[PDB]
């Protein structure tokens, strides 16, 4: 998964204090970081379906979170996806 | 009965501690069952791993025949 230091770094970057770990932007950033991380793994190990399933769960959860954020506050949604560099 | 590991607060069995494993292997060199020894399951699995590692490092015999 993601190391403790990386998680704390992302929380500091995206949350409005050290202790806000549940906010939607923080969750999406953590999911995006992990998803980008695993691309090397699934570029070398191409028959690891049991892990690719967890990867797809991560992608889908990020989709649901982005949809909620977009429908709840468009400004945060645009800022977040522009910072993270995600299409739609 | 009397799983001898829980009563002594054993955290991990050591493949280096041969004498203990010598108590839990039979004469032929096979692992004695937990149903015989009264060992708890978790320590039984640890014991099996440790005995296999000791066999690999030639501190215990796979069988009696080879040596």
């Amino acid at each position: 998964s993601l190391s403790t230091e990386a998680t704390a770094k992302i929380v500091s970057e995206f949350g409005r204090d050290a202790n806000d770990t549940g906010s939607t932007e923080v969750q999406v950033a953590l999911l995006t970081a992990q998803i980008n991380h695993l691309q090397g793994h699934f570029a070398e190990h191409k028959k690891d379906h049991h892990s690719r399933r967890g990867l797809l769960r991560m992608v889908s959860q990020r989709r649901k979170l982005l949809d909620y954020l977009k429908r709840k506050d468009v400004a945060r949604y645009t800022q977040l996806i522009e910072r993270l560099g995600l299409r739609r | 009965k009397f799983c001898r590991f829980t009563a002594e607060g054993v955290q991990e069995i050591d493949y280096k501690d041969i004498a203990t494993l010598k108590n839990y292997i039979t004469e032929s060199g096979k692992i004695v069952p937990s149903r015989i020894t009264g060992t708890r399951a978790k320590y039984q699995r640890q014991l099996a791993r440790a005995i296999k590692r000791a066999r690999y490092l030639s501190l215990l015999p796979y069988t009696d025949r080879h040596q």
């Binding site: - | 039979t26 004469e27 032929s28 009696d64």
Partner: protein, 70 residues
């Protein structure tokens, strides 16, 4: 089973000890079980049936010591 003949022990006693060592190591059961290939499904089915009947006998005994027959 590597039996050493001890001093003053007769041959009958040595042979009895060797027989008991072999029976305790269970060599012949292993050989008879490895004489022919048995499918994984057959192995699993036999194991499950043995467990079921052993458990049933234990439960029957426990019930018997609860209900008198006379």
């Amino acid at each position: 089973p590597v039996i050493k003949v001890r001093e003053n022990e007769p041959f009958d006693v040595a042979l009895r000890r060797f027989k008991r060592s072999c029976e305790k190591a269970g060599v012949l059961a292993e050989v008879r079980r490895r004489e022919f290939y048995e499918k994984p499904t057959t192995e699993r089915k036999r194991a499950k049936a043995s467990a079921v009947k052993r458990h049933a006998k234990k439960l029957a005994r426990e019930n018997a010591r609860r209900t008198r027959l006379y």
